[PDB]
Amino acid sequence: KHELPPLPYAYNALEPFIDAKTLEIHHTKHHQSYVDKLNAALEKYPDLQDKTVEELIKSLNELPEEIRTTVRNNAGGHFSHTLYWNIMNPATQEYIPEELGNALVETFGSIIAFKEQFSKAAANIFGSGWVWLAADANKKLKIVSTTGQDNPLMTGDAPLMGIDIWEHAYYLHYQNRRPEYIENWWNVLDWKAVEERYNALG
Amino acid sequence: KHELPPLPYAYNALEPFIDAKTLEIHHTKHHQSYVDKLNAALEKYPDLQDKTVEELIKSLNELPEEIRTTVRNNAGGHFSHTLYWNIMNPATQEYIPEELGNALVETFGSIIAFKEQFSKAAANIFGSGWVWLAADANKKLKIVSTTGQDNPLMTGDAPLMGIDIWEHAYYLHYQNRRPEYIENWWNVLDWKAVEERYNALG
Ligand SMILES: [Mn+2]
Ligand SMILES: [Mn+2]
């Protein structure tokens, strides 16, 4: 009963920053698999089908042991990819909303300093994982590195943006040149969507 | 002082099972990086510069905390890739030497049962990792799954063979179709090399 949403844009809409073939496989193979695996697990325990993926992630320890790992990885995967697609947009004029821009400046010193810290954390991921910008219960911002499809919901924070550092996110166009992928990704980040998330925390 | 070993074969020698471009990048970029990073980690510790990769892995808990993780990952990476190249060869008629064949049959029931259990473990890796055939001190065999560049040396076992399940190992030719890469990899496995290692355990 969870469904894979259509992308908010065509599979070739993030060219040349992300290649169409990748965006299509990433969505229709990798993300689809997380949804299908999550659904298979939840079909065994159908009262969980009524939970949001966020509720599942935040209550892993309460789920049946049989499916706990499958749910961590696949709800985590579903959540994380959903956010990734929704914070990207066909390459658009740089405009960082005031509230978010000011908070980044206050926290990291400048926008450039934030981008540098974030880029460096992403370049330093070992194996498969993610780098996030997250806000804690009091809206303080941090950069978080995670493994697998783990995400900041698990540590009680609100993810605002994340970059996928799994090799499938970049290998077809960039191969081992992960820094090139990271640098290019900034061109499709939708600051307005990141701002919407931050703003909602009120 | 740690050096990248040459491949025992041409970059196109495992075609069509492993693509030349992959073998070239996998070796000259990924494996090279593990060597360069291990060397960089050891630069400040001339006493450690004399240790084998194997000695480093077997002693990680005794290494300086400053470098421990980097040594685990990069010594592990150097060890793991060295073994991977050396247990592959241009595809030839499958001949499994008697001693190893017999041990596989005694342990798993049949060669095909072993190949099934091994392939299943490889298909089930979440994120970046390896699957190994390993022997204990008594030449008892087991299949081991690891994360990152971890390897059976770390649990006091002798790795005989391992398949790289990091996405960089297969994404250019197979993309998300990891099972296709796994199935194909059997065609380039050098059972003579695996048997050499097993035989050495005496
Ligand atoms: Mn992904
Ligand atoms: Mn590798």
Domains and CATH numbers, chain A: 20-87 (1.10.287.990), 98-201 (3.55.40.20)
With both helix axes pointing from N to C terminus, report the angle between A65-86 and A32-44 in degrees, rounded to the nearest 10.
Answer: 150
- The tally of CA atoms less than 13 A away on the side-chain side of residue B96 is 15
Q: How was this structure determined?
A: X-ray
Q: Which residues of B sit within 8 Å Cβ distance of A? A: 25, 29-30, 33, 73, 126-129, 147-148, 166-168, 171-172, 175-176
Contact B117, B143 (CB under 8 A): yes
Contact A159, A153 (CB under 8 A): yes
* d(C-alpha A175, C-alpha B127), whole Å: 17
- Return the ∠ at Cα A129 (arms to A126 and A130), rounded to 5°: 120
B26 marked ligand binding residue = yes
Residue written as token pair 């450690």: B48
Q: H-helix or E-strand containing B132?
A: strand B129-135
Look up residue A198 and give its two tokens.
């931050």
Amino acid at position A65, single letter: E
With both helix axes pointing from N to C terminus, report the angle between B111-123 and B178-185 in degrees, rounded to the nearest 10.
Answer: 150
List beta partners, residue B135: B141, B158
Look up residue B27 and give its two tokens.
């070796």
Q: H-helix or E-strand containing A84?
A: helix A65-86
Closest C-alpha among A20, A144, A34 to residue A81? A34
* d(C-alpha B166, C-alpha A63), whole Å: 29
Closest C-alpha among B89, B84, B106, B1 to residue B47? B1
Question: DSSP letters along A120-158, please?
Answer: HHHHT--SSEEEEEEE-TT--EEEEEEETT--GGGGT-E
* d(C-alpha A71, C-alpha B157), whole Å: 32
Residue A129: its chain B contacts at CB < 8 A?
Answer: 127
Look up residue B127 and give its two tokens.
């994120």
CA-based nearest distance A170→chain B, Å: 10
Burial label for A58, CB within 10 Å (0-12, 13-18, 19+), is: middle
Residue B167: its chain A contacts at CB < 8 A?
Answer: 128, 166-168, 171
* d(C-alpha A33, C-alpha A26), whole Å: 10
Closest C-alpha among B93, B87, B118 to residue B104? B118
- Return the ∠ at Cα A63 (arms to A44 and A127), rounded to 5°: 100
